Design a protein around this ligand. Structure first.
Ligand SMILES: Nc1ncnc2c1ncn2[C@@H]1O[C@H](CSCCNC(=O)Nc2ccccc2)[C@@H](O)[C@H]1O
Ligand SMILES: Nc1ncnc2c1ncn2[C@@H]1O[C@H](CSCCNC(=O)Nc2ccccc2)[C@@H](O)[C@H]1O
Lengths: 311, 311
């Protein structure tokens, strides 16, 4: 849970994601008017680097909150950089902790999971917004989108599914039923994309509620190559827009530099032929799992069949 | 625990490890005299492929035992290959389950973890041997070794340790103390090896006891390149020897084809210069962690400093 985030390993991976970390750095350093003399809340501050960016940009006060043990490392790091007079770190869940202020001017966080919403803390960020954001205050990143794109990769498909038909001369076909419903997080070869992307979800963190994060979308994939469609890929775009002189965007899609989010891939049980110029129609719904509500399920209808996928 | 092994993902990885899986296949198919008309116990049978190898080689009966939910998939797989009359699958811990026989002729398993002994079930295999192996019976694989080799990789070292000194202009040096004591599982470039390997441990599964698996060894690394020594790497070799006409060996060392075990790397807090022809002397001790006894610690003394490492 918060246990995983107690270990340095995930923090190292996020910090070495240059697209991710340089986007936040650029947003703050190139829009210091958003931070100068402001009270900033960093929801899930981790190692504290985002809090230190906000302090450097002239924040009056930064409150860094994390439930994980990493906050004790943040505490030493803030002291090592001599920022303890500007940055106050608080251990606990943003849902329960006591803040030395009633309201904040700005909320910043990196809450995004695989396919944007997996094991994401947007729900925790929205709690902080509704309870703590001042009237006329701002939350960043402010705008997110989710997109789908069609994939043709018969070899990758055969590696994951057809593999189980003959394993050292033995049939293991009954394994396919456990494999198909698990989404795969992997970097896609952009040469395997056979459609234009379709946006299925737009979120503004200023106006969205937790109930908006379970959604359905009809979609149309404009096919660009006559091929066997073997999978649908998902990815997301992150925007820093509100009150920016220097807007910042990053994509986690396969046409962009890879990030630690990679892409999320939903393998089709039955690949099917498509033709260039075809308008491929489908439906996708995202639900919070009843068991672990940090677990998503994604229901995909395409080519007259429906499959539910989890991460 | 057994929970991780309930999921197909780890079984797919082990089965697609050709060095691992073709070694077991070759051992059984090229030494069928070991199996013909024998009663075979497969300790931790997983998906059941090893049990099916033993049946194909003419086993009278194969008992496949696994604590994990994967055993239910094994049950369908054995039925799909029409081997249910030869292979009996039993769900539970080999330590507690009831077997329809008092003794077995042969025990087979794949128990090996990172650095041979991490989260390894050799203890469970030895329980099965001491309780169930007939007089004059055989256990496979029968012989294992662990080796160390010296590494020079200043860039990899700087990527993992020196990285934390300056992260986007902020000091994060206090992170180094969490990083140094974690062993890294990774495939090494064989060009970075700067010593001959040194064997630190020989196990014969016929004669070894659980108490032998906590051990100390003095070692000498024959340096082959004047360089900065940045790490010590560990790996292991697996032998099928007893009563074989066709002996089988595989190595998980960096001079051999990569396996899912890769190599285990112990980064040095203070890299130090070595000269070609130098006899580098050290000491290594392996202990079962007091907290999780599936967790090892490795204490390494080299160049007049000592560090304890965990996985
Ligand atoms: N309800 C919750 N209340 C309190 N903490 C919670 C809650 N839910 C989750 N968490 C924590 O949120 C973190 C998400 S991972 C981001 C670490 N922070 C960064 O890298 N930031 C950064 C660095 C550079 C650039 C941009 C950002 C974990 O540490 C969780 O322990
Ligand atoms: N005390 C215990 N009692 C019962 N089961 C236990 C115990 N400790 C651990 N386990 C299980 O042992 C497995 C180790 S992973 C190997 C799967 N088997 C293979 O791939 N075999 C194979 C395939 C091809 C070639 C060679 C071998 C897991 O499924 C655990 O659930």
């Amino acid at each position: 849970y918060f246990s995983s985030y107690g270990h340095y390993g995930i923090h190292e991976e996020m910090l070495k994601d240059k697209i991710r970390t340089e986007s936040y750095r650029d947003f703050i350093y190139q829009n210091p008017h958003i931070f100068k003399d402001k009270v900033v809340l960093d929801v899930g501050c981790g190692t504290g680097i985002l809090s230190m960016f906000a302090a450097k940009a002239g924040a009056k006060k930064v409150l860094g909150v994390d439930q994980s043990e990493i906050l004790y490392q943040a505490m030493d790091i803030i002291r090592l950089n001599k920022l303890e007079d500007t940055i106050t770190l608080i251990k606990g869940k943003i849902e329960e902790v006591h803040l030395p202020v009633e309201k904040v001017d700005v909320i910043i966080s990196e809450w995004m999971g695989y396919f944007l919403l997996f094991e994401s803390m947007l729900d925790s960020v929205l709690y902080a917004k509704n309870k703590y954001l001042a009237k006329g205050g701002s939350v960043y990143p402010d705008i997110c989108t989710i997109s789908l794109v069609a994939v043709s990769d018969v070899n990758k498909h055969a590696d994951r599914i057809a593999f189980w038909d003959d394993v050292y001369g033995f049939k293991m076909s009954c394994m396919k039923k456990a494999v198909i419903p698990e989404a795969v997080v992997e970097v896609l070869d952009p040469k395997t994309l056979i459609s234009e992307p379709c946006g299925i979800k737009h979120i503004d963190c200023h106006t969205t509620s937790i109930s908006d994060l379970e959604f359905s979308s009809d979609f149309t994939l404009k096919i660009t190559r006559t091929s066997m469609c073997t999978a649908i890929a998902g990815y997301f775009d992150i925007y820093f827009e509100k009150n920016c002189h220097n807007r910042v965007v990053f994509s986690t899609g396969p046409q962009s530099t890879k990030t630690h989010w990679k892409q999320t891939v939903f393998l089709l049980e039955k690949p099917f032929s498509v033709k260039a110029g075809e308008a491929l129609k489908g439906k996708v719904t995202v639900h919070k799992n009843k068991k672990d509500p940090r677990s998503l399920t994604v229901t995909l209808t395409l080519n007259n069949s429906t499959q539910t996928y989890g991460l």
